[PDB]
Write a protein that binds this ligand. Sequence first.
Ligand code: ZN
Ligand code: ZN
Ligand code: ZN
Ligand code: ZN
Lengths: 244, 244
Amino acid sequence: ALRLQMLGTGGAFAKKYFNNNALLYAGDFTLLIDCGITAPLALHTIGKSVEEIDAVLITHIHGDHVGGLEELAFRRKFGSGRKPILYIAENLVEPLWENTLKGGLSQDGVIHSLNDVFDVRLLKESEPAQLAPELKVELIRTPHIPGKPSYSLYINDEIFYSADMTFEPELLMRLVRERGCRRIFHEVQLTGKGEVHTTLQELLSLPTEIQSQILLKHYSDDMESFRGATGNMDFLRQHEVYTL
Amino acid sequence: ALRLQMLGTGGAFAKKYFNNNALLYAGDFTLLIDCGITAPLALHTIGKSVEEIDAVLITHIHGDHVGGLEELAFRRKFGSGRKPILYIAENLVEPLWENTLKGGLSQDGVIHSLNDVFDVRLLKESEPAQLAPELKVELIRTPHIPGKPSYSLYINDEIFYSADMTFEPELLMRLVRERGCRRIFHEVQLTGKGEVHTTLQELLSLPTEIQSQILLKHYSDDMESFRGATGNMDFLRQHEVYTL
Ligand SMILES: [Zn+2]
Ligand SMILES: [Zn+2]
Ligand SMILES: [Zn+2]
Ligand SMILES: [Zn+2]
């Protein structure tokens, strides 16, 4: 059975919680979903070696989702030398390398492209990929920063992992209505206007049945002020291991 | 009098110590020297608001020195809106923006260049700059990664801050002999071959008088195994406030 453990559950600036990055365990296969500036410290905190990461999947380009990749890449290069598999949309490959990782990683005789530190495997929007015997993943293009591609994930045909996105209640409802969706992991912006994130006020306007599927992530340091005030939804606990 | 507090004293992969980033205090003026993936968490740990950072100086492009700049930039943009001053060599401006920060920070109507999030002030190699009444800083070009510009700092005409560099004992000796150098903060690679860092074995070959000036930084998680074995040198303590 698939297992999920969040390395962190926090929004980009939270300090009680690490960056919102997920570990999925399918048998011996370990997928890291996003790898922010705190992911190395978070891995250390739960006692997980970078050698145990079989693949990394990148949902969009922001420091709390890609800022730890340089450390992961170098440590694997200097350790066993095994390049982690990197799952990513084609339209994020060039920005991730050319505008994010190249500055620190590149070195004349040594590292020239993403392929020198990762085993790059492109995912196509709405084309499911069997990552491992019990782990199927489908990218869904969703909005976050205008003009920048960002993605959510549909897992094993029944788990929606929102990653970072603005409010899309028809998407949620359609996944539950047409695609068998049973569990939803949704980011939430607890205070302020939802310009590039989904607010708690927005999620509370969802129908009761959709709220019952939702565990909340990517949240700020005031999360404890809201415990018990999220209707039928609840907050993911950082480092807890969930089955499914 | 000038004061120094390391946000972290660790090498790039250390987990007992944060990334090797320095705070300098000259009266009310606060300079951050480098801003790695751990710098936001380290600032939080010592209770320092990002609003108190008056300027940031970048010695070279690596995640443990620039990987926290995206979070600093965004938090200042969304907070008081005051752009931090960024001191940097001209030949690092384009790689820092185009190949490191642009991917996550850029946004069509909003952020197009480094100047949209920083007040960029170029430093010239070997041209001292008075940052504040009691803080003069001079970039010295030193080797670290072949083909990449990286810099050390000469402060108030008498403090050498090595930042990241390979072994340059004639430089040290010449600064002590010709330029009045009284204190040296030097990176150290405790184990392994010194390909892009200075090893402890190398520093131990320095003359006794030069060792007496040196406090060690950028060190790995096995630092405590070496305490008392560094001749007349000693290890910097993370978060201690030093006068000078
Ligand atoms: Zn995020
Ligand atoms: Zn984001
Ligand atoms: Zn370094
Ligand atoms: Zn470096």
